[PDB]
Amino acid sequence: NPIRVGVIGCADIAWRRALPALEAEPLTEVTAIASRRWDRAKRFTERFGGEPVEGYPALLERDDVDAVYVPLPAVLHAEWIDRALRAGKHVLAEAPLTTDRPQAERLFAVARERGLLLMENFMFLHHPQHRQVADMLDEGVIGEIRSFAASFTIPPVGGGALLDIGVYPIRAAGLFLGADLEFVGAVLRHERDRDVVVGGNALLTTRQGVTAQLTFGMEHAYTNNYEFRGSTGRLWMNRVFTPPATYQPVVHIERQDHAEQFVLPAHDQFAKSIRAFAQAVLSGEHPREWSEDSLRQASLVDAVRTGARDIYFP
Ligand SMILES: NC(=O)c1ccc[n+]([C@@H]2O[C@H](COP(=O)([O-])OP(=O)(O)OC[C@H]3O[C@@H](n4cnc5c(N)ncnc54)[C@H](OP(=O)(O)O)[C@@H]3O)[C@@H](O)[C@H]2O)c1
Ligand SMILES: Cc1cn([C@H]2C[C@H](O)[C@@H](COP(=O)(O)OP(=O)(O)Oc3ccccc3)O2)c(=O)[nH]c1=O
Ligand SMILES: Cc1cn([C@H]2C[C@H](O)[C@@H](COP(=O)(O)OP(=O)(O)Oc3ccccc3)O2)c(=O)[nH]c1=O
Protein backbone atom coordinates (compact mmCIF):
# COMPACT_ATOMS: atom_id res chain seq x y z
CA ASN A 1 0.00 0.00 0.00
CA PRO A 2 1.63 3.23 -1.25
CA ILE A 3 2.06 5.93 1.29
CA ARG A 4 -0.50 8.58 0.50
CA VAL A 5 1.15 11.94 -0.02
CA GLY A 6 -0.34 15.41 0.27
CA VAL A 7 1.51 18.49 -0.96
CA ILE A 8 1.19 21.85 0.77
CA GLY A 9 1.98 24.74 -1.57
CA CYS A 10 1.94 24.55 -5.35
CA ALA A 11 5.63 25.38 -5.57
CA ASP A 12 7.64 25.63 -8.79
CA ILE A 13 10.03 23.07 -7.37
CA ALA A 14 7.19 20.68 -6.60
CA TRP A 15 5.92 20.98 -10.17
CA ARG A 16 9.38 20.44 -11.58
CA ARG A 17 11.04 17.91 -9.25
CA ALA A 18 9.08 16.43 -6.34
CA LEU A 19 5.69 15.90 -7.89
CA PRO A 20 6.89 14.04 -10.93
CA ALA A 21 8.94 11.88 -8.54
CA LEU A 22 5.93 11.12 -6.34
CA GLU A 23 3.82 10.36 -9.38
CA ALA A 24 6.27 7.80 -10.82
CA GLU A 25 7.22 6.22 -7.47
CA PRO A 26 5.25 2.98 -6.85
CA LEU A 27 5.58 3.50 -3.11
CA THR A 28 3.84 6.85 -2.99
CA GLU A 29 0.47 8.11 -4.17
CA VAL A 30 -0.34 11.80 -4.52
CA THR A 31 -3.68 12.10 -2.76
CA ALA A 32 -4.18 15.86 -2.23
CA ILE A 33 -2.46 19.12 -3.34
CA ALA A 34 -3.26 22.36 -1.43
CA SER A 35 -2.83 26.00 -2.55
CA ARG A 36 -3.90 29.39 -1.24
CA ARG A 37 -5.75 29.52 -4.60
CA TRP A 38 -7.98 26.58 -5.44
CA ASP A 39 -7.39 27.30 -9.16
CA ARG A 40 -3.65 26.75 -8.71
CA ALA A 41 -4.20 23.42 -6.85
CA LYS A 42 -6.53 22.31 -9.61
CA ARG A 43 -3.89 22.99 -12.31
CA PHE A 44 -1.45 20.89 -10.27
CA THR A 45 -3.92 18.05 -9.70
CA GLU A 46 -4.89 18.08 -13.36
CA ARG A 47 -1.21 17.43 -13.97
CA PHE A 48 -0.30 15.00 -11.20
CA GLY A 49 -3.59 13.58 -9.86
CA GLY A 50 -4.99 13.73 -6.34
CA GLU A 51 -7.71 16.03 -4.97
CA PRO A 52 -7.16 19.79 -5.25
CA VAL A 53 -7.55 21.47 -1.88
CA GLU A 54 -8.11 25.15 -0.98
CA GLY A 55 -5.90 26.20 1.93
CA TYR A 56 -3.40 24.09 3.88
CA PRO A 57 -5.40 23.22 7.01
CA ALA A 58 -8.01 21.40 4.99
CA LEU A 59 -5.30 19.09 3.57
CA LEU A 60 -3.88 18.37 7.03
CA GLU A 61 -7.36 17.25 8.10
CA ARG A 62 -7.63 14.53 5.47
CA ASP A 63 -7.66 10.92 6.59
CA ASP A 64 -6.40 9.92 3.19
CA VAL A 65 -2.99 11.65 3.77
CA ASP A 66 -0.19 9.75 5.57
CA ALA A 67 2.63 12.15 4.84
CA VAL A 68 3.01 15.73 3.64
CA TYR A 69 5.66 17.30 1.39
CA VAL A 70 6.35 20.96 2.27
CA PRO A 71 7.96 23.02 -0.54
CA LEU A 72 6.94 26.36 1.08
CA PRO A 73 9.28 29.34 1.49
CA ALA A 74 11.72 28.60 4.28
CA VAL A 75 10.40 31.10 6.77
CA LEU A 76 7.03 29.32 6.59
CA HIS A 77 8.41 25.83 7.22
CA ALA A 78 8.20 25.84 10.95
CA GLU A 79 4.51 26.72 11.33
CA TRP A 80 3.39 24.19 8.75
CA ILE A 81 5.69 21.26 9.62
CA ASP A 82 4.66 21.72 13.27
CA ARG A 83 0.98 21.62 12.26
CA ALA A 84 1.47 18.68 9.89
CA LEU A 85 3.17 16.66 12.60
CA ARG A 86 0.49 17.58 15.14
CA ALA A 87 -2.09 16.41 12.56
CA GLY A 88 -0.23 13.04 12.72
CA LYS A 89 1.42 13.19 9.27
CA HIS A 90 5.05 12.35 8.58
CA VAL A 91 6.85 15.24 6.82
CA LEU A 92 9.28 15.75 3.96
CA ALA A 93 10.41 19.39 4.23
CA GLU A 94 12.38 21.01 1.42
CA ALA A 95 15.77 22.26 2.58
CA PRO A 96 16.35 24.12 4.58
CA LEU A 97 14.30 22.39 7.26
CA THR A 98 13.87 25.66 9.09
CA THR A 99 15.53 28.99 9.93
CA ASP A 100 17.56 28.21 13.06
CA ARG A 101 18.80 25.43 15.31
CA PRO A 102 16.42 25.90 18.30
CA GLN A 103 13.47 25.82 15.88
CA ALA A 104 14.77 22.65 14.21
CA GLU A 105 15.21 20.95 17.67
CA ARG A 106 11.59 21.74 18.59
CA LEU A 107 10.32 20.39 15.25
CA PHE A 108 12.24 17.13 15.79
CA ALA A 109 10.93 16.97 19.40
CA VAL A 110 7.32 17.21 18.17
CA ALA A 111 8.04 14.47 15.66
CA ARG A 112 9.87 12.24 18.14
CA GLU A 113 7.01 12.37 20.66
CA ARG A 114 4.68 11.03 18.02
CA GLY A 115 6.94 8.49 16.32
CA LEU A 116 6.80 10.46 13.05
CA LEU A 117 9.58 10.93 10.45
CA LEU A 118 10.61 14.53 9.84
CA MET A 119 13.06 14.55 6.93
CA GLU A 120 14.93 17.59 5.55
CA ASN A 121 14.98 17.05 1.73
CA PHE A 122 18.43 17.75 0.29
CA MET A 123 17.92 16.05 -3.04
CA PHE A 124 21.68 16.05 -3.85
CA LEU A 125 22.45 13.75 -0.90
CA HIS A 126 20.55 10.96 -2.71
CA HIS A 127 22.75 11.13 -5.85
CA PRO A 128 25.34 8.28 -5.89
CA GLN A 129 27.99 10.57 -7.39
CA HIS A 130 29.05 12.00 -4.04
CA ARG A 131 29.79 8.58 -2.61
CA GLN A 132 31.75 7.68 -5.73
CA VAL A 133 33.79 10.86 -5.33
CA ALA A 134 34.29 10.17 -1.62
CA ASP A 135 35.43 6.62 -2.49
CA MET A 136 38.06 8.03 -4.87
CA LEU A 137 39.24 10.47 -2.20
CA ASP A 138 39.45 7.62 0.34
CA GLU A 139 41.46 5.58 -2.17
CA GLY A 140 44.08 8.40 -2.08
CA VAL A 141 43.61 9.73 -5.66
CA ILE A 142 44.79 13.21 -4.54
CA GLY A 143 46.52 12.27 -1.26
CA GLU A 144 45.44 13.86 2.01
CA ILE A 145 42.67 16.42 1.93
CA ARG A 146 43.82 19.97 2.54
CA SER A 147 40.81 22.13 1.68
CA PHE A 148 37.40 22.09 0.01
CA ALA A 149 35.47 24.68 -2.01
CA ALA A 150 31.83 24.60 -3.14
CA SER A 151 29.67 27.13 -4.89
CA PHE A 152 26.02 27.41 -5.87
CA THR A 153 25.11 30.73 -7.47
CA ILE A 154 22.28 31.63 -9.79
CA PRO A 155 21.21 34.57 -11.95
CA PRO A 156 18.61 36.96 -10.44
CA VAL A 157 8.85 35.88 2.63
CA GLY A 158 11.77 35.05 0.31
CA GLY A 159 14.60 33.42 2.17
CA GLY A 160 17.65 35.29 0.94
CA ALA A 161 20.68 33.69 -0.63
CA LEU A 162 22.00 32.12 2.59
CA LEU A 163 18.88 30.13 3.62
CA ASP A 164 17.79 29.33 0.16
CA ILE A 165 21.09 28.59 -1.62
CA GLY A 166 23.99 28.84 0.73
CA VAL A 167 22.67 25.88 2.66
CA TYR A 168 23.70 23.61 -0.26
CA PRO A 169 27.50 24.25 -0.21
CA ILE A 170 27.35 24.27 3.57
CA ARG A 171 25.65 20.86 3.64
CA ALA A 172 28.18 19.46 1.15
CA ALA A 173 31.01 20.68 3.39
CA GLY A 174 29.39 18.67 6.20
CA LEU A 175 28.90 15.64 3.93
CA PHE A 176 32.58 15.51 2.94
CA LEU A 177 34.50 16.97 5.83
CA GLY A 178 32.51 15.56 8.74
CA ALA A 179 30.87 16.61 11.97
CA ASP A 180 33.41 18.95 13.53
CA LEU A 181 33.19 21.94 11.12
CA GLU A 182 33.39 25.32 12.88
CA PHE A 183 32.68 28.78 11.55
CA VAL A 184 35.71 31.00 10.89
CA GLY A 185 34.42 34.00 8.94
CA ALA A 186 32.03 35.11 6.28
CA VAL A 187 30.54 38.01 4.39
CA LEU A 188 26.89 38.53 3.54
CA ARG A 189 25.93 41.14 0.91
CA HIS A 190 22.44 42.60 1.71
CA GLU A 191 20.56 44.63 -0.91
CA ARG A 192 18.98 47.68 0.83
CA ASP A 193 16.30 48.17 -1.78
CA ARG A 194 14.60 44.93 -0.74
CA ASP A 195 16.49 44.16 2.51
CA VAL A 196 17.57 40.67 1.44
CA VAL A 197 20.82 38.71 1.41
CA VAL A 198 21.80 38.37 -2.26
CA GLY A 199 25.19 36.65 -1.93
CA GLY A 200 27.92 35.60 0.42
CA ASN A 201 31.14 33.69 1.06
CA ALA A 202 31.97 31.69 4.16
CA LEU A 203 35.09 30.08 5.59
CA LEU A 204 34.75 27.01 7.85
CA THR A 205 37.41 24.68 9.24
CA THR A 206 37.64 21.26 10.84
CA ARG A 207 39.67 21.08 14.07
CA GLN A 208 42.58 19.72 12.04
CA GLY A 209 42.54 22.85 9.78
CA VAL A 210 40.86 21.35 6.73
CA THR A 211 39.06 24.50 5.38
CA ALA A 212 35.87 24.88 3.35
CA GLN A 213 35.37 28.01 1.23
CA LEU A 214 31.70 28.27 0.33
CA THR A 215 30.19 30.71 -2.15
CA PHE A 216 26.50 31.33 -2.78
CA GLY A 217 24.34 33.95 -4.36
CA MET A 218 21.55 35.05 -6.57
CA GLU A 219 23.18 37.98 -8.42
CA HIS A 220 25.57 35.79 -10.41
CA ALA A 221 26.14 33.61 -13.43
CA TYR A 222 25.15 30.02 -12.81
CA THR A 223 27.68 27.92 -10.90
CA ASN A 224 27.14 24.63 -9.11
CA ASN A 225 30.43 22.88 -8.32
CA TYR A 226 32.79 21.69 -5.65
CA GLU A 227 36.55 21.10 -5.48
CA PHE A 228 39.01 19.33 -3.22
CA ARG A 229 42.67 20.34 -2.92
CA GLY A 230 44.86 17.41 -1.81
CA SER A 231 48.48 16.82 -0.87
CA THR A 232 49.11 15.24 -4.26
CA GLY A 233 46.31 16.47 -6.50
CA ARG A 234 42.94 18.14 -6.84
CA LEU A 235 39.46 16.94 -7.74
CA TRP A 236 36.50 18.98 -8.99
CA MET A 237 33.11 18.47 -10.59
CA ASN A 238 30.28 20.58 -11.96
CA ARG A 239 26.49 20.19 -11.72
CA VAL A 240 26.98 18.85 -8.23
CA PHE A 241 23.76 19.95 -6.57
CA THR A 242 21.15 19.57 -9.34
CA PRO A 243 22.33 17.18 -12.08
CA PRO A 244 19.55 16.21 -14.42
CA ALA A 245 18.24 12.70 -14.01
CA THR A 246 19.79 11.65 -17.35
CA TYR A 247 23.03 13.69 -16.96
CA GLN A 248 26.35 11.76 -16.68
CA PRO A 249 28.65 13.37 -14.02
CA VAL A 250 32.30 13.86 -14.99
CA VAL A 251 34.91 13.74 -12.16
CA HIS A 252 38.04 15.79 -13.00
CA ILE A 253 41.32 14.99 -11.31
CA GLU A 254 44.63 16.78 -11.85
CA ARG A 255 47.96 15.83 -10.42
CA GLN A 256 51.56 16.58 -11.39
CA ASP A 257 51.89 16.11 -15.17
CA HIS A 258 48.75 14.08 -15.51
CA ALA A 259 44.98 14.78 -15.59
CA GLU A 260 42.05 12.35 -15.90
CA GLN A 261 38.26 12.63 -16.27
CA PHE A 262 35.85 9.85 -15.20
CA VAL A 263 32.28 9.69 -16.55
CA LEU A 264 29.88 8.25 -13.93
CA PRO A 265 26.40 6.78 -14.46
CA ALA A 266 23.36 9.06 -14.59
CA HIS A 267 20.94 8.92 -11.60
CA ASP A 268 17.58 10.51 -10.72
CA GLN A 269 18.30 12.07 -7.36
CA PHE A 270 14.77 13.44 -7.08
CA ALA A 271 13.26 9.94 -7.56
CA LYS A 272 15.81 8.54 -5.10
CA SER A 273 15.12 11.06 -2.36
CA ILE A 274 11.36 10.50 -2.59
CA ARG A 275 12.08 6.75 -2.45
CA ALA A 276 14.28 7.14 0.60
CA PHE A 277 11.54 9.10 2.41
CA ALA A 278 8.84 6.59 1.41
CA GLN A 279 10.93 3.61 2.53
CA ALA A 280 11.61 5.11 5.94
CA VAL A 281 7.92 5.92 6.50
CA LEU A 282 6.95 2.43 5.33
CA SER A 283 9.53 0.51 7.43
CA GLY A 284 9.51 2.91 10.40
CA GLU A 285 13.32 2.96 10.28
CA HIS A 286 13.97 6.74 10.63
CA PRO A 287 17.78 7.05 10.36
CA ARG A 288 19.22 8.84 13.31
CA GLU A 289 21.98 10.18 11.13
CA TRP A 290 19.50 12.25 9.10
CA SER A 291 18.23 14.23 12.04
CA GLU A 292 21.65 14.67 13.63
CA ASP A 293 23.13 15.91 10.29
CA SER A 294 20.15 18.35 9.94
CA LEU A 295 20.71 19.70 13.45
CA ARG A 296 24.45 20.18 12.86
CA GLN A 297 23.57 21.83 9.54
CA ALA A 298 21.20 24.23 11.26
CA SER A 299 23.92 25.15 13.74
CA LEU A 300 26.45 26.02 11.03
CA VAL A 301 23.85 28.06 9.14
CA ASP A 302 23.12 30.05 12.37
CA ALA A 303 26.85 30.43 13.03
CA VAL A 304 27.33 31.85 9.54
CA ARG A 305 24.36 34.22 9.77
CA THR A 306 25.44 35.42 13.20
CA GLY A 307 29.17 35.55 12.54
CA ALA A 308 29.16 37.01 9.01
CA ARG A 309 30.26 40.53 8.35
CA ASP A 310 27.08 42.03 6.89
CA ILE A 311 27.48 44.56 4.05
CA TYR A 312 24.59 46.59 2.67
CA PHE A 313 24.86 48.01 -0.83
CA PRO A 314 24.81 50.25 -2.52
N1 LIG B 1 14.02 28.32 -6.98
C1 LIG B 1 13.77 27.24 -6.26
O1 LIG B 1 12.94 26.39 -6.57
C2 LIG B 1 14.59 27.10 -5.02
C3 LIG B 1 15.96 27.38 -5.00
C4 LIG B 1 16.66 27.20 -3.80
C5 LIG B 1 15.96 26.75 -2.68
N2 LIG B 1 14.65 26.50 -2.76
C6 LIG B 1 13.89 26.04 -1.59
O2 LIG B 1 12.67 25.39 -1.94
C7 LIG B 1 11.65 25.83 -1.05
C8 LIG B 1 10.63 26.50 -1.97
O3 LIG B 1 11.28 27.65 -2.49
P1 LIG B 1 10.68 28.30 -3.86
O4 LIG B 1 11.59 29.50 -4.01
O5 LIG B 1 10.33 27.23 -4.90
O6 LIG B 1 9.27 28.99 -3.42
P2 LIG B 1 8.06 29.50 -4.40
O7 LIG B 1 8.03 29.01 -5.82
O8 LIG B 1 7.91 30.89 -3.84
O9 LIG B 1 6.87 28.49 -3.97
C9 LIG B 1 6.50 28.45 -2.61
C10 LIG B 1 5.03 28.02 -2.65
O10 LIG B 1 4.65 28.34 -1.32
C11 LIG B 1 3.37 28.90 -1.20
N3 LIG B 1 3.29 30.10 -0.33
C12 LIG B 1 2.62 30.23 0.83
N4 LIG B 1 2.72 31.51 1.26
C13 LIG B 1 3.46 32.16 0.34
C14 LIG B 1 3.89 33.48 0.25
N5 LIG B 1 3.51 34.31 1.26
N6 LIG B 1 4.62 33.83 -0.83
C15 LIG B 1 4.96 32.97 -1.82
N7 LIG B 1 4.58 31.67 -1.74
C16 LIG B 1 3.82 31.28 -0.67
C17 LIG B 1 2.94 29.20 -2.65
O11 LIG B 1 2.07 28.09 -2.90
P3 LIG B 1 0.48 28.26 -3.15
O12 LIG B 1 0.45 29.54 -3.93
O13 LIG B 1 0.07 27.18 -4.10
O14 LIG B 1 -0.09 28.32 -1.76
C18 LIG B 1 4.23 29.02 -3.47
O15 LIG B 1 4.05 28.39 -4.74
C19 LIG B 1 12.28 26.70 0.04
O16 LIG B 1 12.64 25.80 1.12
C20 LIG B 1 13.56 27.20 -0.64
O17 LIG B 1 14.68 27.26 0.26
C21 LIG B 1 13.94 26.65 -3.88
C1 LIG C 1 21.12 24.53 -15.23
C2 LIG C 1 21.03 26.04 -15.17
C3 LIG C 1 20.16 26.66 -14.29
N1 LIG C 1 20.07 28.00 -14.26
C4 LIG C 1 19.15 28.62 -13.31
C5 LIG C 1 17.68 28.22 -13.44
C6 LIG C 1 17.21 28.22 -12.00
O1 LIG C 1 16.79 29.56 -11.72
C7 LIG C 1 18.44 28.09 -11.11
C8 LIG C 1 18.51 26.76 -10.36
O2 LIG C 1 18.44 25.77 -11.39
P1 LIG C 1 18.87 24.21 -11.13
O3 LIG C 1 20.32 24.15 -10.72
O4 LIG C 1 18.66 23.60 -12.49
O5 LIG C 1 18.07 23.54 -9.93
P2 LIG C 1 16.48 23.31 -9.73
O6 LIG C 1 15.78 24.03 -10.87
O7 LIG C 1 16.34 21.84 -9.41
O8 LIG C 1 16.35 24.30 -8.48
C9 LIG C 1 16.62 24.11 -7.15
C10 LIG C 1 17.88 24.46 -6.67
C11 LIG C 1 18.13 24.30 -5.31
C12 LIG C 1 17.12 23.83 -4.46
C13 LIG C 1 15.86 23.50 -4.95
C14 LIG C 1 15.61 23.65 -6.31
O9 LIG C 1 19.56 28.22 -12.00
C15 LIG C 1 20.86 28.77 -15.02
O10 LIG C 1 20.79 30.01 -14.96
N2 LIG C 1 21.73 28.23 -15.91
C16 LIG C 1 21.80 26.88 -15.96
O11 LIG C 1 22.60 26.34 -16.74
C1 LIG D 1 20.63 10.30 2.49
C2 LIG D 1 20.71 11.34 3.58
C3 LIG D 1 21.88 11.37 4.34
N1 LIG D 1 22.00 12.25 5.36
C4 LIG D 1 23.26 12.23 6.11
C5 LIG D 1 23.49 10.90 6.84
C6 LIG D 1 24.94 10.52 6.56
O1 LIG D 1 25.61 11.09 7.68
C7 LIG D 1 25.41 11.38 5.37
C8 LIG D 1 25.58 10.60 4.07
O2 LIG D 1 24.58 9.57 4.03
P1 LIG D 1 24.54 8.59 2.74
O3 LIG D 1 24.34 9.47 1.53
O4 LIG D 1 23.52 7.48 2.88
O5 LIG D 1 26.01 7.88 2.80
P2 LIG D 1 26.87 7.37 1.52
O6 LIG D 1 28.14 6.74 2.03
O7 LIG D 1 26.03 6.66 0.49
O8 LIG D 1 27.32 8.78 0.86
C9 LIG D 1 28.40 9.56 1.18
C10 LIG D 1 28.88 10.48 0.22
C11 LIG D 1 29.97 11.32 0.50
C12 LIG D 1 30.61 11.24 1.75
C13 LIG D 1 30.11 10.35 2.71
C14 LIG D 1 29.02 9.51 2.43
O9 LIG D 1 24.34 12.30 5.16
C15 LIG D 1 21.01 13.13 5.61
O10 LIG D 1 21.12 13.97 6.52
N2 LIG D 1 19.85 13.13 4.89
C16 LIG D 1 19.68 12.25 3.87
O11 LIG D 1 18.61 12.27 3.22
Ligand SMILES: [Cl-]
Ligand atom coordinates in the same frame (compact mmCIF):
# COMPACT_ATOMS: atom_id res chain seq x y z
CL1 LIG E 1 32.45 19.34 -16.96
Ligand code: NA
Ligand atom coordinates in the same frame (compact mmCIF):
# COMPACT_ATOMS: atom_id res chain seq x y z
NA1 NA F 1 26.14 38.89 11.43
